Amino acid sequence: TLTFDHSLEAQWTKWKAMHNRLYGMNEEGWRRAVWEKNMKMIELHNQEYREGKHSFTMAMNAFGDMTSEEFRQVMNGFNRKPRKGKVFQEPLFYEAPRSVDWRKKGYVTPVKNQGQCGSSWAFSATGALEGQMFRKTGRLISLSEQNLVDCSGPQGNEGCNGGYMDYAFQYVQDNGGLDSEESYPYEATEESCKYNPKYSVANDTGFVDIPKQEKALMKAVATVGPISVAIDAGHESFLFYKEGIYFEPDCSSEDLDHAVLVVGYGFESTESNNKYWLVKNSWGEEWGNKGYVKMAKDRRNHCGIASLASYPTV
Ligand SMILES: [Cl-]
Ligand SMILES: [Cl-]
Ligand SMILES: [Cl-]
Ligand code: NA
Ligand code: NA
Ligand code: NA
Ligand code: NA
Ligand code: NA
């Protein structure tokens, strides 16, 4: 789609080089038009942010030239049977703190990147299990999402098409283990099961589903550790989120399409609409705030953060 703002040429050339992009002549043209449309969308949003019209900023990242089909590959197809897990019982007399950050306590591995594969359910599951294994042993070991992708078909998952964290937790229970990231590295595609129990570094005894309430989620995060959740991530504002508390008016509490990990919660030093969930994504460190997003908290289950929350028991 020819016609380009050539004042973006230097940024476009740099962006292509930073993201290993090289196009023939026809593809160069329309990819550049998609990227420029997004650049201008981001720049306008941020201008509006500087005028106090949004709670968060946006930034160009690795999604800048993608088409709809490519976005869908980074979105979870999810097949929602009744949930089955044990029900989380709120500890009434535990006093949850005003702020939690499990990263700072050693529960959380570095940010990963699911690539062009609908495997966020697997990253969410490994993140929750990484946290529970650490709480149990004091050993932080990155776990194999590829193991889950290749092997948990029987439990109901569909590899890069999508899956559920509870199905992943069920697989680890049935299977008696899960291999380490180091032994079973991630390939961003579905392949034959290669689980080797000699390299298993995790186990689980089941899983717990949290009631669909932000209060219950807050108490779960405070008392358990990181929690697997699913959200409505299907908006440009999230795809190119940079910093701040994310609040998207068009967000749904019911229609979820992407799994993430809640590792904490807190508040901004200004005035209470100032609370947030601390959320680890699986879109690499280039996305968001070094791979993290602050999601609006206590704003009527914004983006469904409490609608599909669970954790494994170990
Ligand atoms: Cl600190
Ligand atoms: Cl450690
Ligand atoms: Cl509920
Ligand atoms: Na601007
Ligand atoms: Na640690
Ligand atoms: Na990464
Ligand atoms: Na910013
Ligand atoms: Na900034």
Both structure tokens of 234: 């299907």
Q: Which ligand is nearest to the CA of 186?
A: 6
Do the beta carbons of residue 224 and residue 311 sit within 8 Å?
A: yes
Residues with CB under 5 Å of ion ligand 4 are 43, 47
Q: Which residue has the tokens 């098409």?
A: 161
| Residue ranges with CB less than 5 Å from ion ligand 5 | 106, 140
The DSSP 8-state label assigned to residue 190 in this structure reads -
SS3 110: coil
Residues 6+ apart with CB under 8 A from 301: 212, 213, 214, 253, 307
> In the 3-class helix/strand/coil scheme, how is 134-185 assigned residue by residue?
HHHHCCCCCECHHHHHHHCCCCCCCHHHCCCHHHHHHHHHHHCCEEECCCCC
Cα distances (Å, whole numbers) of residue 126 to 98, 130, 146, 251: 26, 6, 10, 26
The rounded Å distance from CA 58 to ligand 8 centre is: 10
Q: Which ligand is nearest to the CA of 43?
A: 4
Q: How far is the CA of 59 from the centre of ligand 7 (A)?
A: 8
Residues at Cβ < 5 Å from ligand 7 ion: 57, 242-243
Ligand number nearest CA of 290 is 6
Query: Quick one: which of 196, 136, 206 has its CA closest to 174?
Result: 206
Closest ligand (CA of 82): 3
Q: How far is the CA of 22 from the centre of ligand 8 (A)?
A: 29
Q: CATH classification of 1-314, choosing from 3.90.70.10, 1.10.3210.10, 3.10.580.10, 3.40.50.150?
A: 3.90.70.10
126: Cβ contacts below 8 Å, ≥ 6 apart: 142, 143, 144, 145, 148, 168, 178, 181
Q: How far is the CA of 38 from the centre of ligand 8 (A)?
A: 19
* Resolution to one decimal, Å: 1.8
| Amino acid at the residue 282 | S
Rounded (5°) CA angle 192-194-199? 165
Calpha distance 186→189 (Å, rounded): 8
Comparing C-alpha atoms, which of 142, 110, 133, 124 is closest to residue 262? 124
Expressed in angstroms and rounded, the spacing between residue 133 Cα and the centre of ligand 5 is 10
Helix/strand/coil for 74: coil
- Residue 256 CA: distances (Å) to CA of 141, 229, 234, 252: 29, 10, 8, 7
Domain boundaries, the chain: 1-314
**What's the sign of the alpha-carbon dihedral 259, 145, 311, 293?**
negative
Distance 136 CA to ligand 5 centre (A): 12
- State the alpha helices, DSSP H only, in the chain: 9-18, 25-50, 68-73, 120-137, 145-151, 165-175, 214-224, 236-239
